[PDB]
Amino acid sequence: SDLKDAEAVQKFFLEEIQLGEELLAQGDYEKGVDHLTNAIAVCGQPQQLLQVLQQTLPPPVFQMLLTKL
């Protein structure tokens, strides 16, 4: 890992979170969760992100997100 490698991961992470958030605002719960799942997948320790998402999403939506990992 150089700076390019981490930078591409940070950028993907940020794009997916943004898409996740927009799609959910539009009520496409399924695709929004897919995007959030991609952002979670690239974090070695997603606990804090998950706690923030639990505070931000409706419970059944957060639930769903947990089943996908």
Partner: peptide
């Protein structure tokens, strides 16, 4: 979209 990213940085 973006408020979620902002919220995540804050720490």
């Amino acid at each position: 979209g973006x408020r979620l990213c902002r919220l995540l940085s804050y720490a």
